[PDB]
Amino acid sequence: PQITLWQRPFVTVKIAGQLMEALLDTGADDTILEEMSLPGRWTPKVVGGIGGFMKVRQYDQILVEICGHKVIGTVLVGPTPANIIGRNLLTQIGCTLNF
Amino acid sequence: PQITLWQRPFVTVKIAGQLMEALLDTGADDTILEEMSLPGRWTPKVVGGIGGFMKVRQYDQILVEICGHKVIGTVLVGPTPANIIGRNLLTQIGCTLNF
Numbered sequence: 001p002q003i004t005l006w007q008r009p010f011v012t013v014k015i016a017g018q019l020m021e022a023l024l025d026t027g028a029d030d031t032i033l034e035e036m037s038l039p040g041r042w043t044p045k046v047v048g049g050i051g052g053f054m055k056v057r058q059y060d061q062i063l064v065e066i067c068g069h070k071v072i073g074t075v076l077v078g079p080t081p082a083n084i085i086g087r088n089l090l091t092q093i094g095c096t097l098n099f
Numbered sequence: 100p101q102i103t104l105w106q107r108p109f110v111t112v113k114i115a116g117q118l119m120e121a122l123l124d125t126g127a128d129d130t131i132l133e134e135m136s137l138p139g140r141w142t143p144k145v146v147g148g149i150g151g152f153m154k155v156r157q158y159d160q161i162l163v164e165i166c167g168h169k170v171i172g173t174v175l176v177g178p179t180p181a182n183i184i185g186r187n188l189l190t191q192i193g194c195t196l197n198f
C-alpha cells in the first residue's frame with residue numbers, strides 16, 4: 001500500500017494469535033506494544049521518549065504479521081499509550097517514506 | 100526523494116534563519132523542535148508520549164523549509180530529545196509511507 005498522512009497510519013497486526021492496531025512510526029527505532037500476554041523469556045530494558053522514560057520487557061525473535069506480511073524481530077511490551085511499529089520491523093516490510 | 104528506514108529519517112530543516120536536523124516522524128501528530136529562539140507570541144500546551152508529558156510553547160503559522168520545500172504550520176518548542184517533523188507538516192510536503 002501507499003498511505004497518506006492526513007490521519008494516523010494504523011495497520012492491523014497479529015502477534016501470538018492476538019489482533020491489534022499499531023502505528024507505522026518512522027520516528028521509533030523500536031517496536032513497542034501495549035500490555036499483552038506473550039510467552040517465553042525476556043530482558044528488562046527502559047525506553048526513552050517525549051516525557052522521559054518507560055520500563056519495558058524485551059522479547060526477541062517474535063513473529064509479527066503486519067498487514068498479513070510476516071516479520072520476525074524484537075518486540076518491547078509495556079505501558080505505551082499507542083502500539084508502535086518501529087524501524088526494526090518497518091525495514092522488513094520494505095517500508096519507505098516518499099516526499 | 101524515497102528514503103529507506105535502516106537509519107533514522109533525518110532531514111535538514113531551516114526555521115527562522117536557523118538550520119537543524121529533524122526526524123520525519125509518521126507517529127507524531129505534531130512538529131516539536133528543541134529549545135530554539137522563535138518570535139513572537141505563543142500559547143502554552145503540553146504534549147504526551149512514551150514516558151509521560153512535556154510542557155511546550157505553541158507557535159502558529161511558522162514557515163519551515165524541509166529539504167528546501169516550504170511549508171507553514173504549527174511548531175511546538177520545548178525540551179524534546181529530538182527535533183520531530185509530525186503529520187501536520189508531513190502532509191504539506193506530500194509525504195507518504197510505501198510498504
Ligand SMILES: CCOP(=O)(COc1ccc(C[C@H](NC(=O)O[C@H]2CO[C@H]3OCC[C@H]32)[C@H](O)CN(CC(C)C)S(=O)(=O)c2ccc(OC)cc2)cc1)OCC
Pocket residue numbers: 023025026027028029030031032047048049050051052053081082084086122124125126127128129130131146147148149180181183185
Ligand atoms: C528522553 C531522551 O530519550 P530519547 O531516546 C527519545 O528521543 C525521541 C523521542 C521521541 C521520538 C518520536 C516518538 N518515538 C518514540 O517514542 O520512539 C521510542 C521507541 O523507539 C525509540 O526510538 C527513539 C525514541 C524511542 C514518536 O515518533 C512520536 N510520539 C510517540 C508515540 C506516541 C508514537 S511522540 O513523540 O511522543 C509525540 C509527537 C507529537 C505529538 O503531538 C501530538 C505527540 C506525541 C523520537 C526520538 O533520545 C534519543 C536521542
